[PDB]
């Protein structure tokens, strides 16, 4: 009773819905912003698009809602729909690639002397620079800048919790990636009067090892038929034609591979590294098989009286066997041996190279997890 | 205090939001547009659709918003939310594919005098020419008109604000590149009606396309195929033993050319390139076609290639000799003298066609690169 | 000039949902018209389209002719949507998607009570293109639209030219073309047996298409293909013995290519419309190509196999010569190529005929509807 | 008329009743709220990303003490309707599966009992991120956990107490629903200094996998395998089909490669385990290897891959001489090795082929354990 | 005049729309519902989705709408805005995949008595069984139940009105054809609860599907592939000299149909059918494999066909006689006799299992055709 109807009344009589919990132009209302992440569902590492979900915990004080006996001293804590406070119509300078879901228009926790607690989980369409640099083992970092899209920091100050909180705090276990750390730094670019956005850093690490495995098999298994086509010459010289069949076959195979590679990066591309040199490794088996094909080509051919008849017989046979013996002199196997071992150098050299680069790529550019 | 409540309430009462600050029958409501694309998110030259960042600077005056010491004296310039304002139905003429995004419920600023600005952070859906003339090396100028939508120059007039580039905030992630962009004003009166119609801002986007990755993959299997067909020439004249062997290649390669066709027309369908680009491939690819068919039909062009005891000896020797003849006949079929002709016949052809393909390639690259 | 009082007077009696019908037995005079401006999606196989239509809306309601303070002030007024009778438009046969931006827009009230309004609308519809619209003779797109609310005994729509156009702003990036747009104003009585006619708006659109790009992709391959098989056909007479199988390699290659085509463009017609006539010539000229093609192997399949002590022993050896000769003789009577050579000219003229039958007829199905 | 005008004026739902005020008899323990979960349908499953679109009947109950009516409300009709804006509605949040706001399970018509008890239960088209993990593929196919409850209120403003999942499991799913337990609870946490919001915890333990991919996929293996199997039987019956035998490698090779290509395609659409994916590609490689083996083994050997008297002696010389050539080749032939090859092809096919369904079983036995 | 203001004012005060015209503890609210289906714009057999239009003919009564000379007297039948009506949440039980569209904001039929109807041109997306047994020749009847959503019998009741076919306005452009359509009513009380539950209208659509496109191309490659198989068998007789050639065509053949089955899975899962069907193709074609298995295995089935001066004359003819009986050996194996049994053995067996394929295929359609 104690002026309850009165209080109650006066409050709703004088209280202003559309007003800011501050008095004039000054230090403003110090709103607390801090989100406990739920998990993330889709990383479009290719366009640098980020759809995650977290809690929008906001909290500041409404010294305009401090109650009295019944709602203050009666029930120190009571729930009341928002819709009555300035809400950070927050957009993300890079990210905020789309609207809020479970972000605004939801109830809030209002304390006795005016404290306000609003904890809503939400899904948000963002876009961070995971750029086409989300695959190097050295990976990269990003700028996630949150802030309102009609308000300018003049009638409120924004403030954070931790900066180490981490993003693996609610990292998706469903992620083909991994994370090292999440930096959180408060910002106010001076290119705009409006103090604004906060930059949040993603020192992301995404190592999904699954198909590069059977990709290796081609390179090496194709090599099987490759070393084979380079081995088949002094193995079965008649490989002559069958050889060409091999490369038709070998080339179509690698071209189909050419088919799956562009359409697969089509959703998760970054530096060429792997492709850069396998591209070379490609060109390598490609041309090596084709010049060996020219190795194959280079051969212009390969690619008394009684006794007289006898004598005429003696000369017939012998005469042309030298001729076909000439073909021997012409297609001997010197090259095959020499370049099948130049094949030895080439393929085992260029092989242990990307082997190496790849080797160097996973270990060397790994520690910049920062 | 200072007429506190009397101040605020009076203002609400006699003021109709929907009213347009019409001032006598003349100048119309003078309202100016000023678009600053902060940045672009994505574009589809094929479907000529773009999602872009726009901060619309909208200006106009409402002499009804002028004040005295009890509104301007309170705090010079202040923040009043939109609603109460008459929002020009802005519209991109041949564009407009989408609603202005974040135009709604934003705020504006009123001066001690009245002058108001409405500059809400937009990003929207666009629709501009690309025609099959945008992907050219010689580009096309995206004609984009902007201006008042349902009001005439007698009720209202949209005017421009300034010059500024489109590559000022052009997307570096675009598969295209900018030349220049200009925008000049205009008033459109129609021979239809004797009346004076709306005003408009006309954008002109002059940019040339094609990211270079494409460039390399395609022309190299061509010089690739060039060498196999090059081999298609040299293989036969230096070795007609694997004519059919090459039969294989002819199959494996035009099919390679066939499947490359699925890939690049979808590219074609993925990105609108001026068809006159297509003829490059047309004759080029098709000569691979006319040349083969002749080269290999010719490759193919050849009939079959692609005392008494003493007398016994002479009836027998005579048998060996006319078959001797016969052998020479079929060889008199596959000569190695003109396969050399076709070699230089066409290689000059290829160095002609090729250098002719390089011709227009080089030529308008003498125009584009400029 | 009672400016305030007048506004306040009518608004007193101002009636919303009531039509400006003098009385109830002669309806009101409603004017409408549409100017096409965007034909956004042509999915003819499903008979649906999306267009930005200028819904020219006009009618009469003197319920507000004014005095010196509003009529005379300015013979022109722009008053909000929700403030006068509004035709909820839709295309009987087409509109399959509620109008977008086609309503809730500023209307126009002159001074005598003339009402003009014209919102732009992107919406979905379903015109003809029913197993026809892909010919050279075109199915006239017939869209009738009217208010879907009341029926002509209270409402009456008007129109204008039924002779003059859809190509007024028919899109230049359409894979088609328009040649005439007729439009009639009519009463309501359909096949379904509905009475009390509510007049509507008929939209004829007989348009052309078929600007083939795929034509010569189809025309040169087939000639190359025909020649390839005619290679198969004449190449044998030129080709060596190791060519029977040579020819086979081509069949394999020839149809690998074939059904791959059969898979390529069939896809084409499913994503877009369909029609069987043009379809018939291809597959059957195609099946005949296949027919005489396998026929060829069955042709290069047909034939049986081409698919004193001194003298006693001189006697018998002179026999192996004549003996084997009888055998090589076999080859003779078997491979005397009457059928093969003639098979070349067989397919040749048959080629000419299949071709003439087809392109001559394609000449016709372009020339009757021309 | 029995005080009806007056009484609903007494309740005035919106005006007299505090709809923005939840009747929890003021600050105390809580309003006894109860949630009931019944899946009406499961339309889409995404095993790879642990996401599910499913429909639920959001059966809700709580007593609205200000809702109790009198004769011309209560007894006039011991049951009547009243919209959401005129009925207190729990703010049920799909705790770990509402990362996709609820549809038409929102502000819907509710049922008004006579003595305040109210009943609101409409349809929920929802999306969830259930505990798939890369362990939602072994045969147990995990247990999908979900919690439902009134999000906003705590343990002194709300108490929610507590149906099979296959009750409306979708029959067009590529999986199988084995069980679905239901038990409510309430729980505070470390950072919170007080207990609150009670919830409906419903675990769904399921299983899935086709008996169809097995069909057309192993099918080609015994068919293909017989080719490679015959491959070694064929080197005997006629190894002279050198080039043509070579053709088949190209051909059995191109077949092999894109077969594996279709594999990841459906793979990405499905998070496949490492245990199974290897037996597939391991064994096709077994043939791939033996195709390469086919190569060499099929082309592996170096070669197989007195005057009148004077004259004819010349021939008997040329005779014998190239007879040595002729034979230098059969030296290479290696034919008494033939059967052992295809015998030691049989043995291994038996070894590995068995090794797989041997392993098939050694893991087929323990789950059935 | 005629109690002008007194009549419409009184009507608004003591009138309510939230309420339903409940009349004592009995038959519920007499709801009359029906389907008036005139267009089926889009449906997918595969996903069993149907977006059609059916004017929801509702019919029931509310005495409160009865009137005297001041509403009935005004103009017999008057049509009131639907708002005043209690609209049922009707919905497709196992369907309802989409909102009904165009029902809101419409006209309502009122009578002097009270009779009322409102047929809304509702268009919506549906969801009913088609399963894999949707498109056979013997059809399936899609069970479509419709009835009140959240209201039980104790408050509202609906009932059929008339029988009307489904083909009354069935799509002539459908990839299917109808046979019959029945709709009977019922009330469903459940063993769960002792209560009397909702009523509903259950439609059953009986119609056979499948155009013949997929059909023509399944069987063409089959007969054509049976031509090459037929060649498969005939060649060893007319050209066994190309057994290897045969091998090539089996790599050909095999890849082609292995690729044919690729199409199947895409198409089949892209357009639904009862698996029992593909079973036909399965074994029939595994039959060409099982048979080429044996036949070419059998084809390759054969070991390798897959004085003193008087003295040497004798060592010599000896040389010849040894080899001659030897060549007789390889022919000893290729007896050219079993080759004829294999084509006839299988020609009959394929003519028989083909006739077997032909059998259930035609038997099933001698069932369908019905």
Curated annotation (Swiss-Prot), chains B, E:
Keywords associated with the record: Cell membrane, Disulfide bond, Glycoprotein, Ion channel, Ion transport, Ligand-gated ion channel, Membrane, Postsynaptic cell membrane, Receptor, Signal, Synapse, Transmembrane, Transmembrane helix, Transport
Location(s) in or outside the cell: Postsynaptic cell membrane; Cell membrane
Disulfide cross-links: 128-142, 192-193
Residue ranges that the UniProt entry lists as topological domain Extracellular: 1-210
Transmembrane segments: 211-235, 243-261, 277-296, 342-360
UniProt membrane topology term: Multi-pass membrane protein
Pfam families in the cross-refs: Neur_chan_LBD, Neur_chan_memb
Catalysis performed (reactions): K(+)(in) = K(+)(out); Na(+)(in) = Na(+)(out)
GO molecular function: acetylcholine-gated monoatomic cation-selective channel activity; transmembrane signaling receptor activity
Cellular component terms (Gene Ontology): postsynaptic membrane
Keyword Transport: yes
SUPFAM superfamilies, A to Z: Neurotransmitter-gated ion-channel transmembrane pore (SSF90112), Nicotinic receptor ligand binding domain-like (SSF63712)
InterPro entries associated with the record: Neur_chan_lig-bd (IPR006202), Neur_chan_lig-bd_sf (IPR036734), Neur_channel (IPR006201), Neuro-gated_channel_TM_sf (IPR036719), Neuro_actylchol_rec (IPR038050), Neurotrans-gated_channel_TM (IPR006029), Neurotransmitter_ion_chnl_CS (IPR018000), Nicotinic_acetylcholine_rcpt (IPR002394)
Carbohydrate-modified residues: 141
Oligomeric and partner information: Pentamer of two alpha chains, and one each of the beta, delta, and gamma chains.
Family the entry assigns: Belongs to the ligand-gated ion channel (TC 1.A.9) family. Acetylcholine receptor (TC 1.A.9.1) subfamily. Alpha-1/CHRNA1 sub-subfamily.
Role this protein plays: Upon acetylcholine binding, the AChR responds by an extensive change in conformation that affects all subunits and leads to opening of an ion-conducting channel across the plasma membrane.
NCBIfam families for the chain: LIC
Protein's name in the database: Acetylcholine receptor subunit alpha
Organism expressing this protein natively: Torpedo marmorata
């Amino acid at each position: 009773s104690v002026m309850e109807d009165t209080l109650l009344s006066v409050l709703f009589e004088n209280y202003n819905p559309k007003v800011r919990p501050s008095q004039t132009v000054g230090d403003k209302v110090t709103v607390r912003v801090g989100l406990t992440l739920t998990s993330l569902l889709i990383l479009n590492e290719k366009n640098e698009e980020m759809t995650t979900s977290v809690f929008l915990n906001l909290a500041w004080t409404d010294y305009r809602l401090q109650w009295d006996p019944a709602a203050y001293e009666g029930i120190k804590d009571l729930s009341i729909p928002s819709d009555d406070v300035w809400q950070p119509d927050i957009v993300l300078m890079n990210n905020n690639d789309g609207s809020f879901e479970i972000t605004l228009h939801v109830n809030v926790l209002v304390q006795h002397t005016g404290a306000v607690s609003w904890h809503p989980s939400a899904i948000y369409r963002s876009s961070c620079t995971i750029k086409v640099m989300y695959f190097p083992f050295d990976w990269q970092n990003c700028t996630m800048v949150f802030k309102s899209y009609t308000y300018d920091t003049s009638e409120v100050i924004l403030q954070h919790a931790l900066d180490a909180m981490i993003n693996q705090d609610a990292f998706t276990e469903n992620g083909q990636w991994s994370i090292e750390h999440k930096p959180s730094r408060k910002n106010w670019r001076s290119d705009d009067p409006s103090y604004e956005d906060v930059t949040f850093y993603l020192i992301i690490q995404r190592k999904p090892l699954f198909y590069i495995v059977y990709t290796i098999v081609p390179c090496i298994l194709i090599s099987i038929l490759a070393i084979l086509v380079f081995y088949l010459p002094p193995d079965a010289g008649e490989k002559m034609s069958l050889s060409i069949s091999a490369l038709l076959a070998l080339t179509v195979f690698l071209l189909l591979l050419a088919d799956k590679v562009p359409e697969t990066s089509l959703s998760v591309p970054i530096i060429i590294s792997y492709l850069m040199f396998i591209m070379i490794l490609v060109a390598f088996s490609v041309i090596l098989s084709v010049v060996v094909l020219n190795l194959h080509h280079r051969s212009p051919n390969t690619h008394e009286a009684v006794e007289a008849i006898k004598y005429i017989a003696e000369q017939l046979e012998s005469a042309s066997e030298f001729d076909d013996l000439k073909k021997d002199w012409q297609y001997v196997a010197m090259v095959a041996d020499r370049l099948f071992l130049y094949i030895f150098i080439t393929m085992c050299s260029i092989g242990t190279f990307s082997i190496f680069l790849d080797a160097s790529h996973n270990v060397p550019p790994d520690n910049p997890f920062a | 205090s200072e007429h506190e409540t009397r101040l605020v309430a009076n203002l609400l009462e006699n003021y109709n939001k929907v009213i347009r600050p019409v001032e006598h029958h003349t100048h119309f409501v003078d309202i100016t547009v000023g678009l600053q694309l902060i940045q672009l998110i994505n574009v589809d030259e094929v479907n000529q659709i773009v999602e872009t960042n726009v901060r619309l600077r909208q200006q106009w005056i409402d002499v009804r918003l002028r004040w005295n010491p009890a509104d301007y004296g309170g705090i010079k310039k202040i923040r009043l939310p939109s609603d109460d304002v008459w929002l020009p139905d802005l519209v991109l003429y041949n564009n407009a594919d989408g609603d202005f995004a974040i135009v709604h419920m934003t705020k504006l600023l009123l001066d001690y005098t009245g002058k108001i600005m409405w500059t809400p952070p937009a990003i929207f859906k666009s629709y501009c020419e690309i025609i099959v003339t945008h992907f050219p090396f010689d580009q096309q100028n995206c004609t984009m008109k902007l201006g008042i939508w349902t009001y005439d120059g007698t009720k209202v007039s949209i005017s421009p604000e300034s010059d500024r580039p489109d590559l000022s905030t052009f997307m570096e992630s675009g598969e295209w590149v900018m030349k220049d962009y200009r925008g000049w004003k205009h008033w459109v009166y129609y021979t239809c009606c004797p009346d004076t119609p709306y005003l408009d801002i006309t954008y002109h986007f002059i940019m040339q396309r094609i990211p270079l990755y494409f460039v390399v993959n395609v022309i190299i299997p061509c010089l690739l195929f060039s060498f196999l067909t090059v081999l298609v020439f040299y293989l036969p004249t230096d070795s007609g033993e694997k004519m059919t062997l090459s039969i294989s290649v002819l199959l494996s390669l035009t099919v390679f050319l066939l499947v490359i066709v699925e890939l690049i027309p979808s590219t074609s369908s993925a990105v609108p390139l001026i068809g006159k680009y297509m003829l490059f491939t047309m004759i080029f690819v098709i000569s691979s076609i006319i040349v083969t068919v002749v080269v290999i039909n010719t490759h193919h062009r050849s009939p079959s290639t692609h005392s008494a005891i003493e007398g016994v000896k002479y009836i027998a020797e005579h048998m060996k000799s006319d078959e001797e003849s016969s052998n020479a006949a079929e060889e008199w079929k596959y000569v190695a003298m003109v396969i050399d002709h076709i070699l230089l016949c066409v290689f000059m052809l290829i160095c002609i066609i090729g250098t002719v393909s390089v011709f227009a390639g080089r030529l308008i690259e003498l125009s584009q690169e400029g | 000039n009672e400016e305030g009082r007048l506004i306040e007077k009518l608004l007193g009696d101002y009636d919303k949902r009531i039509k400006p019908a003098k009385t109830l037995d002669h309806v009101i005079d409603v004017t409408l018209k549409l100017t096409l401006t965007n034909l956004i999606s042509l999915n003819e196989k499903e008979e649906a389209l999306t267009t930005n239509v200028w819904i020219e809306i006009q009618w009469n309601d003197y319920r507000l002719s004014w005095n010196t303070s509003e009529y005379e002030g300015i013979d022109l007024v722009r008053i909000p949507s929700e403030l006068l009778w509004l035709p909820d438009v839709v295309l009987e046969n087409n509109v399959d998607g509620q109008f977008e931006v086609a309503y809730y827009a500023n209307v126009l009230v002159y001074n005598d009570g003339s009402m003009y309004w014209l919102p732009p609308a992107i919406y979905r519809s379903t015109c003809p293109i029913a197993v026809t619209y892909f010919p050279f003779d075109w199915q006239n797109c017939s869209l009738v639209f009217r208010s879907q609310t009341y029926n002509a005994h209270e409402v009456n729509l008007q129109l204008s030219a039924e002779e003059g156009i859809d190509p007024e702003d028919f899109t230049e990036n359409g894979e088609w073309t328009i040649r005439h747009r007729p439009a009639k104003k009519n009463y309501n009585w359909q096949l379904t047996k509905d009475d009390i006619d509510f007049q509507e708006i008929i939209f004829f659109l007989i348009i052309q298409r078929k600007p083939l790009f795929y034509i010569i992709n189809i025309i040169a391959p087939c000639v190359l293909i025909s020649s390839l098989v005619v290679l198969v056909y004449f190449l044998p007479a030129q080709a060596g013995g190791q060519k029977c199988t040579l020819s086979i390699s081509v069949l394999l290659a020839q149809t690998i290519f074939l059904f791959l085509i059969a898979q390529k463009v069939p896809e084409t017609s499913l994503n877009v419309p369909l029609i069987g006539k043009y379809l018939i010539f291809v597959m059957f000229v195609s099946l005949v190509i296949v027919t005489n093609c396998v026929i060829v192997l069955n042709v290069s399949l047909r034939t049986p196999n081409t698919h004193s002590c001194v003298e006693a022993c001189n006697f018998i050896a002179k026999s192996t010569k004549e003996q084997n000769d009888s055998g090589s003789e076999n080859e003779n009577w078997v491979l005397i190529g009457k059928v093969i050579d003639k098979a070349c000219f067989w397919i040749a003229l048959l080629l000419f005929s299949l071709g003439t039958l087809a392109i001559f007829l394609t000449g016709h199905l372009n020339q009757v509807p021309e | 008329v029995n005080e009806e005008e007056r009484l609903i004026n007494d309740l005035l739902i919106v005006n007299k009743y505090n709809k923005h005020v939840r009747p929890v008899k003021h600050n105390n323990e809580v309003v006894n709220i109860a949630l009931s979960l019944t899946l009406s349908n499961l339309i889409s499953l995404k095993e790879t990303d642990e996401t599910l679109t499913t429909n639920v009947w959001m059966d809700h109950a709580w007593y609205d003490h200000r809702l109790t009516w009198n004769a011309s409300e209560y007894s006039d009709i011991s049951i009547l309707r009243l919209r959401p804006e005129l009925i207190w509605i729990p703010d049920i949040v799909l705790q770990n599966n509402n990362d996709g706001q609820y549809n038409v399970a929102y502000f819907c018509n509710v049922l008004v009992r006579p003595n305040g008890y109210v009943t609101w239960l409409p349809p929920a088209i929802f999306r969830s991120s259930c505990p798939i993990n890369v362990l939602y593929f072994p045969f147990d196919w995990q247990n999908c956990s979900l919690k439902f409850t009134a999000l906003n209120y705590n343990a002194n403003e709300i108490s929610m107490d507590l149906i099979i999942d296959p009750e409306a499991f979708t029959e067009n799913g590529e999986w199988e629903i084995i069980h679905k337990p239901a038990k409510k609870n309430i729980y505070g946490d470390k950072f919170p200094n007080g207990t609150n919001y009670q919830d409906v915890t419903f675990y769904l333990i399921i299983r899935r996998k086709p008996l169809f991919y097995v069909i057309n996929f192993i099918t080609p293996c015994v068919l293909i395998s017989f080719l490679a199997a015959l491959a070694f039987y064929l080197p005997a019956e006629s190894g002279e089909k050198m080039s043509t035998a070579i053709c088949v490698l190209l051909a059995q090779a191109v077949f092999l490669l894109l077969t594996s290509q279709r594999l990841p395609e459906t793979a990405l659409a499905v998070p496949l385990i490492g245990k199974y994916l290897m037996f597939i590609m391991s064994l096709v490689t077994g043939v791939v290897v033996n195709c390469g083996i086919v190569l060499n083994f099929h082309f592996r050997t170096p070669s197989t891959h007195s005057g009148i008297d004077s004259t004819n002696y010349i021939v008997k010389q040329i005779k014998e001489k190239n007879a040595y050539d002729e034979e230098v080749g059969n030296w290479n032939l290696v034919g008494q090795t033939i059967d052992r090859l295809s015998m030691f092809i049989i043995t291994p096919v038996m070894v590995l082929g068995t090794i797989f369904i041997f392993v098939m079983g050694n893991f087929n036995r323990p789950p059935a354990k």
